[PDB]
Amino acid sequence: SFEKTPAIKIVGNKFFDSESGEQFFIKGIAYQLQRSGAFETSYIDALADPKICLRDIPFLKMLGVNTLRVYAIDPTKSHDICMEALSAEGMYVLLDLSEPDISINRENPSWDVHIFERYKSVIDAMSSFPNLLGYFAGNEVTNDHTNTFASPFVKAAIRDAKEYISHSNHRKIPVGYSTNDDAMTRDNLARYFVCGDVKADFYGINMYEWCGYSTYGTSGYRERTKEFEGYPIPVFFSEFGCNLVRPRPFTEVSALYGNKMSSVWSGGLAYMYFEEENEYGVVKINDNDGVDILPDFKNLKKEFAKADPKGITEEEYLTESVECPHIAVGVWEANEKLPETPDRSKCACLDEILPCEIVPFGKYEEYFSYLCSKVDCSDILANGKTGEYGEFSDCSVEQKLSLQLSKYCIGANDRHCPLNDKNVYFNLESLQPC
Ligand SMILES: OC[C@H]1O[C@@H](O[C@@H]2[C@@H](O)[C@H](O[C@@H]3[C@@H](O)[C@H](n4cc(COCc5ccccc5)nn4)O[C@H](CO)[C@H]3O)O[C@H](CO)[C@H]2O)[C@H](O)[C@@H](O)[C@@H]1O
Numbered sequence: 432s433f434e435k436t437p438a439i440k441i442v443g444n445k446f447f448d449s450e451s452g453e454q455f456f457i458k459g460i461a462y463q464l465q466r467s468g469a470f471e472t473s474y475i476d477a478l479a480d481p482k483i484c485l486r487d488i489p490f491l492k493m494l495g496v497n498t499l500r501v502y503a504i505d506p507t508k509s510h511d512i513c514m515e516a517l518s519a520e521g522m523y524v525l526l527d528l529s530e531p532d533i534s535i536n537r538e539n540p541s542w543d544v545h546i547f548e549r550y551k552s553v554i555d556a557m558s559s560f561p562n563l564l565g566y567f568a569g570n571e572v573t574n575d576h577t578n579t580f581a582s583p584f585v586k587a588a589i590r591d592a593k594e595y596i597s598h599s600n601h602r603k604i605p606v607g608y609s610t611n612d613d614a615m616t617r618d619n620l621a622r623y624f625v626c627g628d629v630k631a632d633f634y635g636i637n638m639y640e641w642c643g644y645s646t647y648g649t650s651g652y653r654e655r656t657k658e659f660e661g662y663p664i665p666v667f668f669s670e671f672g673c674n675l676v677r678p679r680p681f682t683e684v685s686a687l688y689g690n691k692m693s694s695v696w697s698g699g700l701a702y703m704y705f706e707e708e709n710e711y712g713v714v715k716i717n718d719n720d721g722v723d724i725l726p727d728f729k730n731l732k733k734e735f736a737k738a739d740p741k742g743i744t745e746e747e748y749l750t751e752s753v754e755c756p757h758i759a760v761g762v763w764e765a766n767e768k769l770p771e772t773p774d775r776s777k778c779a780c781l782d783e784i785l786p787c788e789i790v791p792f793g794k795y796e797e798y799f800s801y802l803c804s805k806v807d808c809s810d811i812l813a814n815g816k817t818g819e820y821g822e823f824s825d826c827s828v829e830q831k832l833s834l835q836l837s838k839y840c841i842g843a844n845d846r847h848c849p850l851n852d853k854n855v856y857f858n859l860e861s862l863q864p865c
Pocket residue numbers: 463465502503527529530531532533534535536537538569570571572639670702
């Protein structure tokens with residue numbers, strides 16, 4: 432049963448409970464365990480392990496949260512036990528689609544079949560749960576003025592995740608984005624993710640401006656609130672909780688759910704539940720795997736308990752595309768033109784028909800540098816500044832390298848692929864006459 436968590440929907444720039452019609456405010460906390468050859472995932476999935484999640488939900492109940500942010504799940508595992516247990520306490524989940532080893536690389540951005548398959552796998556694993564609030568299609572991909580050209584790839588991912596969900600039988604769970612708070616890029620990022628024909632469904636900011644006993648005016652919260660007034664999609668703090676002054680008083684919570692900010696922001700999520708040698712936890716898991724409550728816990732609890740955001744209703748709220756930021760060198764370099772939807776069938780054709788292949792199972796930079804001096808690699812390049820995306824730039828890195836290696840076609844016709852490496856092999860399927 433999911434009776435205590437009706438699905439949340441979006442109308443305009445606010446979240447609403449689909450049954451009651453009351454505005455939904457996120458009162459959240461991040462919930463994600465870390466690890467301190469390859470028979471286990473690098474990330475830990477607490478929502479796939481009942482002994483972990485059922486230990487912590489009682490403490491999450493005491494905190495008074497209605498939402499968790501989860502950064503990584505293992506889509507091959509079941510999550511029904513933990514998601515139902517969360518639902519029984521009225522708790523929702525915001526979930527990143529990416530994971531540390533399968534994300535849009537801000538240093539070399541691509542939007543390809545490998546990353547898209549990850550996103551699809553998470554969507555298909557988690558979309559049956561009414562308490563899945565929303566998906567993040569990226570987290571702080573562009574994070575300063577040197578990598579703004581990564582953002583078109585994130586917008587493509589938003590578009591394609593939304594389209595995949597639309598064409599599925601699933602509930603149309605919204606897909607948004609989580610950004611950082613770099614002064615020189617933040618305004619352009621916010622506009623970019625609602626500009627043109629593709630829009631984020633909601634916008635999370637990882638917000639650490641309020642440290643210690645600050646105020647609405649002095650923290651920067653007032654200027655942020657004025658900046659986001661009239662923003663066309665729901666906006667909230669996807670992280671908060673500056674730890675400069677400890678124990679964290681969390682007095683930002685009073686501002687966030689007060690009358691000035693509650694008309695603009697849809698709440699936020701504290702970072703985070705677990706203490707991981709970083710002074711950001713509200714609990715520490717001891718050597719006996721038990722929960723030890725830390726000094727921050729009582730302050731966050733008291734602040735969430737006192738918070739009482741005066742929202743509006745769905746019916747009372749109900750009673751011209753925005754221009755993308757212009758390009759300026761060294762400032763904003765995200766083209767409005769987005770890469771195409773990654774095509775698994777076209778890229779799977781390369782696995783079938785190419786004479787020379789390379790298995791995945793340092794070498795990429797060396798072999799791309801080598802091969803792209805011998806053949807034209809334009810067809811696998813993707814440029815988010817200029818909006819030029821090669822025909823096969825949506826294929827996996829190994830497919831891309833295999834294409835260039837095959838482009839063999841020297842013309843010896845002797846099944847000897849022109850690259851010395853154990854991962855290189857001649858594909859016998861290429862001989863069989865998409
Ligand atoms: O796309 C982009 C990239 O994404 C990286 O992967 C990120 C990965 O870096 C990110 O890590 C977050 C991480 O960003 C987040 N976090 C929060 C904090 C608190 O920050 C305090 C702080 C705040 C401001 C200033 C100083 C300090 N520190 N880390 O913590 C959670 C849980 O502990 C981590 O899962 O999680 C995302 C979702 O799983 C991944 O997509 C990739 O590794 C990579 O190649 C790819 O360029």
